[PDB]
């Protein structure tokens, strides 16, 4: 079986957090944890939460044994945009968009004997 957790409307830029997600793809849960703890990014925190919430769905909802699950799949999609006004010189007003991500960690049991 495979299990997944999704953090949605997370107030962070996709392109930013996608960077650490790609860092755990295909790895054991044991390793992945050790990676996020010392990855120096704001995205670590969030991805950590999603991952741990995914495991906590495998063992308690799908029977998967924590010692055998890897990061089968992981991705982050673009949530809706927070458009905000940025006042500029000569009365301009730009619009910066505070971006938003949909983090999706998806776990599976390693095919170990």
Partner RNA sequence: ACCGUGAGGGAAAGGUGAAAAGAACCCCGGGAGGGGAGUGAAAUAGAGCCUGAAACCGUGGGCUUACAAGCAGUCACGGCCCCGCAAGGGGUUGUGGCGUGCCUAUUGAAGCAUGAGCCGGCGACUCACGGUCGUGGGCGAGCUUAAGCCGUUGAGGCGGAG
Partner RNA sequence: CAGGUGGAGCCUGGGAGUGAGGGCGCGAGCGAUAACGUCCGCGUCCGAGCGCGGGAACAACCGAGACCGCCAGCUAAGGCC
Partner RNA sequence: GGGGGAUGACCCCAGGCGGUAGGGGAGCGUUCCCGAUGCCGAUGAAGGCCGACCCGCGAGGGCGGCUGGAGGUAAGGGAAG
Residues 108/69, Cβ–Cβ less than 8 Å: yes
d(CA 10, CA 102): 6
Residues 43-72, one symbol each (x = binds RNA by CB under 7 A, - = not), give: ------x--xx--xx--xxx----------
Burial of 8 (0-12, 13-18, 19+ CB in 10 A): exposed
Half-sphere exposure of 54 (CA within 13 A, CB side): 29
Residues 11-50, one symbol each (x = binds RNA by CB under 7 A, - = not), give: ---x---x---x--x-----------------------x-
Among 12, 76, 107, 109, which residue interacts with RNA (rule: CB under 7 A)? 76
Residue ranges binding RNA (CB under 7 A) = 3-10, 14, 18, 22, 25, 49, 52-53, 56-57, 60-62, 73, 75-78, 80
């Amino acid at each position: 079986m495979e299990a997944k957790a999704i953090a949605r409307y997370v107030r962070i830029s996709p392109r930013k957090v996608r960077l650490v997600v790609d860092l755990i793809r295909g790895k054991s849960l044991e390793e992945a944890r050790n990676i996020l703890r010392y990855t120096n990014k704001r995205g670590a925190y969030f991805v950590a939460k999603v991952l741990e919430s995914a495991a906590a769905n495998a063992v308690n909802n799908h029977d998967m044994l924590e010692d055998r699950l890897y990061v089968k799949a992981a991705y982050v999609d673009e949530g809706p945009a927070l458009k905000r006004v940025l006042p500029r010189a000569r009365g301009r007003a730009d619009i910066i968009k505070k971006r938003t991500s949909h983090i999706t960690v998806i776990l599976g049991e390693k095919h170990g004997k």
